């Protein structure tokens, strides 16, 4: 099954059920100067959990595209180390606002994943906060999951708020089971970090409020959101174990592995940049252009990311900007604004990439040597500042290649050295 | 070698390296309104590091009584289940004040355990921050030890900050391994968790200044705090895996078993009493009282759960003011105010349990019914909620009864429960 036939069928499934299907907002926040890029499916629906925006309906389902590379939700240093994390993923979600709860959700996302979708139970493993005596009574005596394959876990994971005051409330979790050829412990266990039990989908309970003075209240309308990986689900269902093996990124992995002129298509750095033009055309089609401040800046760290990695691949010429035309080929039926901007985004990448190139070839060297010198594992603070500041090198991008290497970089020295600059300036 | 042949012995090696043998301070720290209690030796010296305050001298050697039951980390929850935490226990301590930084402050710790108390390298595991080469190189170059027991770890665990602006740097850590006998693997791993690889000293290289805006520039003079717990090093020199074995608590589990009738000497609930009287008698020693209040209510929820304790033991009669004795006969030349204040502690400890000796009976009923008829595995909110309001039992004596049973608590539950309590006023 394709991911556009998940994405398609998660619509209409929950549109059968009374869901307005709604469009994608954009990856910039409308309302909303503190957060970098929407990060969820939540973002735009914010002002309506909170009762500030009324809008003529009480549930709804989106496909919504997310960058998570700044905040705590920065998965940027995951991409090509995971079978499971983007910088740029679809987030298919439904919402209650003020409509259902607990039991129906819960039902929804099992009779989709299990009915729709006819994923072995077996395969699924569940969570629920452990002071959710609600959630595990539906999951266990309604629902009846197998017992075993469940966790009960604590405030960290399974207990969400909006902020120190607001709505707040207990989450569930189902994960899949990719088995024992991977890596990992269930959730709960020392080793749930693995690939091995990959989180699927997401159910959040807005369940209580707290008042600025730290009452908690019970929410007069209690309300749901829920968030799936697309991508995740797609693997699930296409039978990989890594996102990057399913069918929306063939095209854009064997793309980049002719530019690499490269027969491993497993190859990390091949994965990295399929990732990265995703979340780079797609912040350029919503309006983000290279800088170095906010939000462009995030943009410029990951264009240069990417370019380096193909550094590392060999490439010689200009090459980041010839996966757009992939990327819009894939994409472009459930995102036409890719396709209408699809130039403007080619030639804000070429013309990216070619600045860093200016400097690109001359870092590297620097660093390169500095490896075949050093006689610890740490980059030193003088050399990271000096690509930073002469090489246009984030000090993110230092850092990714070091670790390629087993090495670090000098965190606390590069922030000397700036402090110093800052004087000097 | 006995705990205070320990303590001894640490003060005098600093002593003869030219260090200042300091008292303790109190457990109510004096200048620092947001503490509750004393947790490090370095609290009354926060204002020498900050250059806030001027001393005579420039090095500096504590054995620190602290508690950790509030705040950060916090261990109460800890123990009884492990080998490692309690509510009280000392901090053995050397510090610089703008004098020695990273290179001594190795070397004196390496020299304490492995030629002072002969500890075999082969047994010690040495982790340094991963970008502090300095400290690296120190360990691998100079002191040579093992490489092959030495680990790089990230910030979250070697980097020290003391507050949001102010001196803040890299640290290092000496651990034990206990061995084969003890569940858990080194520092840095999945396992690192487990009682096997104890961690012993901690030492903290005060080496930046951050700023109100998130500067950060070299502290002028780089400053040494180091931190070691005398029990874990004291289970080391005596042969044992658990600080529950150690001298000073073979004398108070034996007295509490003594107290309980049994001659079960592992019953986790006598561990408990045995730490517990500890901060209880000295928080007395040091002029907190039981109170609803900040400090005296942290003093209050102790020694409440450790009459639970005694319940669950079947002690018939008021019984936590007679382990004062016992502790200020084990204690009491290191510690001669628990000497001077013996009887008021005494006192003081009496009342407080025979104050909650009104209840406990009857809110033990209470407790004991709800779980021979509870459905699921979570206390409601509104019987914790009955057993705070009118039989005083703190919301975690609640918790802590709940685990034993694997149960936990509707803490939401309990919060929208008093919410609705100030509503009625
Ligand atoms: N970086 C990512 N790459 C790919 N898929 C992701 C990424 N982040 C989240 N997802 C998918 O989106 C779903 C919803 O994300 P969300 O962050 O709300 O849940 P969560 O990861 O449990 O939250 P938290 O980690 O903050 O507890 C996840 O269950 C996962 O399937
Ligand atoms: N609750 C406790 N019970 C017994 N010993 C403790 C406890 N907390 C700390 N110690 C001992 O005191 C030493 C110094 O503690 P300190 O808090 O400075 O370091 P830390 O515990 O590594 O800090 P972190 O909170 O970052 O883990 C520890 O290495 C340990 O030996």
């Given at each position: 099954?394709?991911?556009?036939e998940?994405?398609?069928?998660?619509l209409?499934?929950?549109?059968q059920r009374g869901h307005?299907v709604?469009?994608?907002?954009?990856?910039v926040?409308?309302?909303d100067?503190?957060?970098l890029?929407?990060?969820?499916?939540?973002?735009?629906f914010k002002?309506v959990?909170?009762?500030?925006?009324?809008?003529?309906?009480n549930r709804?389902?989106?496909?919504?595209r997310?960058?998570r590379?700044?905040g705590?939700?920065?998965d940027?240093?995951?991409?090509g180390?995971?079978?499971?994390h983007?910088?740029?993923?679809e987030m298919?979600?439904?919402?209650?606002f003020g409509?259902?709860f607990?039991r129906?959700?819960?039902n929804?996302?099992?009779?989709?994943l299990?009915?729709?979708?006819?994923?072995?139970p077996a395969?699924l493993?569940?969570?629920?906060?452990d002071?959710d005596?609600?959630?595990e009574?539906?999951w266990?005596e309604?629902?009846?999951?197998?017992?075993?394959?469940?966790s009960?876990?604590?405030?960290?994971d399974?207990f969400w708020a909006?902020?120190?005051?607001?709505?707040?409330?207990?989450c569930?979790?189902i994960?899949?089971?990719?088995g024992?050829?991977?890596?990992?412990?269930?959730?709960?266990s020392?080793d749930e970090?693995?690939?091995?039990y990959?989180?699927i989908?997401?159910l959040?309970?807005?369940?209580?409020?707290?008042?600025?003075?730290?009452?908690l209240?019970p929410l007069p309308?209690p309300?749901?959101?829920?968030?799936?990986?697309?991508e995740?689900?797609a693997?699930?269902?296409?039978?990989?174990?890594?996102?990057?093996?399913?069918?929306?990124?063939q095209?854009?992995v064997k793309?980049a592995?002719?530019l690499?002129?490269?027969?491993?298509?497993?190859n990390?750095?091949?994965?990295?940049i399929?990732?990265?033009?995703?979340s780079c055309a797609f912040?350029?089609?919503d309006?983000?252009?290279?800088?170095?401040?906010g939000?462009?800046?995030?943009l410029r760290?990951?264009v240069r990311?990417?370019?380096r990695?193909?550094?590392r691949?060999?490439?010689?010429?200009?090459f980041?900007?010839?996966?757009?035309?992939?990327?819009?080929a894939?994409?472009?039926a459930?995102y036409?604004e890719?396709?209408?901007?699809?130039?403007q985004?080619?030639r804000?990448?070429?013309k990216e990439?070619e600045?860093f190139?200016?400097?690109?070839?001359?870092?590297?060297?620097?660093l390169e040597?500095?490896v075949?010198?050093?006689?610890?594992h740490?980059?030193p603070?003088?050399?990271?500042?000096?690509?930073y500041?002469?090489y246009?090198?984030p000090?993110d991008?230092?850092?990714?290649?070091a670790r390629?290497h087993?090495?670090?970089?000098d965190?606390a020295?590069?922030?000397?050295?700036?402090?110093?600059?800052r004087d000097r300036?």
């Amino acid at each position: 099954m394709t991911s556009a036939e998940i994405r398609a069928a998660f619509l209409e499934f929950f549109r059968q059920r009374g869901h307005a299907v709604r469009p994608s907002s954009s990856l910039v926040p409308g309302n909303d100067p503190t957060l970098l890029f929407t990060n969820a499916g939540m973002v735009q629906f914010k002002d309506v959990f909170l009762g500030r925006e009324k809008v003529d309906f009480n549930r709804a389902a989106t496909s919504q595209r997310c960058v998570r590379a700044g905040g705590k939700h920065n998965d940027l240093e995951n991409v090509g180390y995971t079978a499971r994390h983007h910088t740029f993923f679809e987030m298919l979600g439904n919402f209650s606002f003020g409509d259902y709860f607990k039991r129906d959700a819960i039902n929804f996302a099992w009779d989709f994943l299990t009915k729709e979708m006819g994923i072995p139970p077996a395969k699924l493993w569940v969570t629920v906060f452990d002071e959710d005596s609600e959630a595990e009574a539906i999951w266990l005596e309604e629902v009846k999951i197998d017992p075993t394959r469940f966790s009960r876990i604590g405030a960290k994971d399974n207990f969400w708020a909006m902020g120190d005051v607001g709505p707040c409330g207990p989450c569930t979790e189902i994960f899949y089971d990719h088995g024992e050829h991977v890596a990992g412990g269930p959730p709960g266990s020392p080793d749930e970090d693995g690939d091995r039990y990959i989180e699927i989908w997401n159910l959040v309970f807005m369940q209580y409020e707290r008042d600025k003075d730290g009452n908690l209240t019970p929410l007069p309308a209690p309300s749901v959101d829920t968030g799936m990986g697309l991508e995740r689900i797609a693997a699930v269902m296409q039978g990989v174990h890594s996102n990057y093996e399913i069918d929306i990124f063939q095209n854009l992995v064997k793309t980049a592995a002719a530019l690499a002129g490269t027969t491993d298509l497993s190859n990390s750095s091949l994965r990295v940049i399929a990732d990265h033009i995703r979340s780079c055309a797609f912040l350029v089609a919503d309006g983000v252009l290279p800088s170095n401040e906010g939000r462009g800046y995030v943009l410029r760290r990951i264009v240069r990311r990417a370019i380096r990695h193909g550094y590392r691949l060999g490439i010689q010429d200009t090459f980041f900007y010839k996966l757009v035309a992939p990327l819009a080929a894939e994409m472009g039926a459930a995102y036409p604004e890719l396709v209408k901007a699809q130039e403007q985004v080619e030639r804000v990448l070429k013309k990216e990439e070619e600045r860093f190139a200016e400097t690109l070839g001359q870092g590297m060297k620097i660093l390169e040597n500095c490896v075949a010198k050093l006689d610890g594992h740490v980059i030193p603070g003088d050399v990271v500042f000096l690509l930073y500041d002469t090489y246009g090198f984030p000090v993110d991008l230092t850092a990714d290649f070091a670790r390629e290497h087993n090495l670090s970089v000098d965190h606390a020295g590069f922030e000397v050295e700036m402090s110093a600059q800052r004087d000097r300036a």
